[PDB]
Amino acid sequence: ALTGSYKSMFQKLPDIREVLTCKIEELGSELKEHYKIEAFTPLLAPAQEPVTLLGQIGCDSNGKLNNKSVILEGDREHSSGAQIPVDLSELKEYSLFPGQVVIMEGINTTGRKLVATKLYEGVPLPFYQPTEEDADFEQSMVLVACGPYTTSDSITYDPLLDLIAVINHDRPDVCILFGPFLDAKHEQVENCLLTSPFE
């Protein structure tokens, strides 16, 4: 998880495509092996009988996702990355968002529009297996706070001083401090009124 700083801010469309399809295919293999799914089918194949279909959900247009403005985009090795609208009228219970990998067992008798009939709740990863040393740890308290640490119209950082005071008083084991530490959306910096460099 990024011991070093970084490499680039240069993107390549084919490589982003490879990342996306790799994510889809990995989630698909995991779900298929867990659910013992027989076999996936291409999105554009017109199949009369209900056929399981794999792919990531997406919004048809550029706006907020609507319950009847949803398409399924498949993987390359099964559907060649094709897209197909999905109809949720028949589906009973669901919870979707753009870019989530799903296996939908809807019926698609025309090949141009799928109608959902059941959604497969995705399976979480296995937990972290502890060891004897892990159980050998006494109770420890953890602090967690998230910025910004100054009010919308201040630089005195009084909230940070109060947080430091409580940290000193409680003497917690580990303290997690999230950013931002000088918010980019702060009106003070958004208007570049500061007399010192950001760094």
């Binding site: 017109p46 199949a47 009369q48 028949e90 019926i107 008798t109 025309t110 109608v115």
Partner: protein, 285 residues
């Protein structure tokens, strides 16, 4: 490989034993204990075969997304030359049939109008009777090559699914071999008969903007065919005249498919390609 068989070629079998019970729907059967008992003879010309061009109209069920076949039409040519020019006319007989899926009440005096016009058509009460009649007809005609549009992906699959759901008698009549249990089937469905999709063959031969039937007819035969949207035929069933118009349109579509196949002469091309390559003609088509 062992018998040195190179595509369709006259094969002569020695010591043909006649099996006690039929195993297929063909008129003649024979037995061969070992593959070596059959040899290949070359100096003979191919015989003419039977070609049936078929087209049907499916409709999504009103309730929930299920295809339903309502109208069928098919042209036949018993003696179809495979080396000479495509016979003109490309057919000498045909048959059509229509049915009401679940609630599409027949227009009043429908069969009366049919008999008044005295055109070749039969009325089937339900999808089951439609499929039964079609299977009986195809078995009685035993077409070696069945040609259609979108048979590879859409028409054949929906036909098989409707037959299975309706449990029509002798589902195996489609293929020449008889099998008791439904198959589940890339080519096992039509064992014995040569399915030819005009779109794939045209894509093999010519280049077009899109290989949909209308575009193919435009670019090939330089003629226009009226497209009947499936969404408008929901009320189509309440009036005899427009129903007969739809039936005649299906017949016209079958004629167009047959004419495309004949003028593009895909059959002799497949013969020669298979003979050159030696593979199975079904895999070629």
């Amino acid at each position: 490989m062992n018998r040195k068989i190179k595509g369709p070629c006259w094969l002569e079998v020695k010591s043909p034993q006649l099996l006690n019970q039929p195993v297929s729907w063909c008129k003649v059967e024979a037995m061969a204990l070992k593959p070596d008992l059959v040899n290949v003879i070359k100096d003979v010309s191919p015989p003419p075969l039977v070609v049936m061009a078929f087209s049907m109209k499916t409709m999504q069920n009103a309730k929930n997304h299920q295809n339903e076949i309502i109208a069928m039409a098919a042209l036949v040519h018993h003696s179809f030359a495979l080396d000479k020019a495509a016979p003109k006319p490309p057919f000498q007989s045909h048959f059509c049939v229509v049915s009401k899926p679940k609630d599409c009440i027949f227009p009043y005096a429908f069969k009366e109008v049919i008999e008044k016009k005295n055109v070749k058509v039969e009325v089937a009460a339900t999808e089951r009777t439609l499929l039964g009649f079609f299977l009986a007809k195809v078995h009685k005609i035993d077409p070696d090559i069945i040609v259609g549009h979108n048979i590879y992906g859409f028409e054949l699959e929906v036909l098989l699914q409707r037959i299975n759901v309706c449990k029509a008698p002798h589902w195996s009549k489609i293929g020449r071999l008889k099998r008791s249990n439904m198959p589940k089937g890339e080519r096992n469905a039509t064992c014995g008969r040569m399915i030819c999709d005009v779109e794939i063959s045209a894509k093999e031969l010519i280049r077009c903007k899109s290989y949909h039937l209308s575009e193919l007819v435009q670019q090939i035969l330089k003629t226009e065919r009226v497209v009947i949207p499936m969404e408008n035929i929901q009320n189509m069933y309440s009036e005899s005249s427009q129903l007969l118009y739809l039936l005649e349109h299906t017949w016209k579509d079958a004629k167009f498919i047959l004419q495309i196949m004949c003028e593009l002469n895909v059959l002799p091309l497949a013969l020669q390609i298979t003979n050159i390559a030696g593979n199975i003609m079904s895999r070629t088509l």
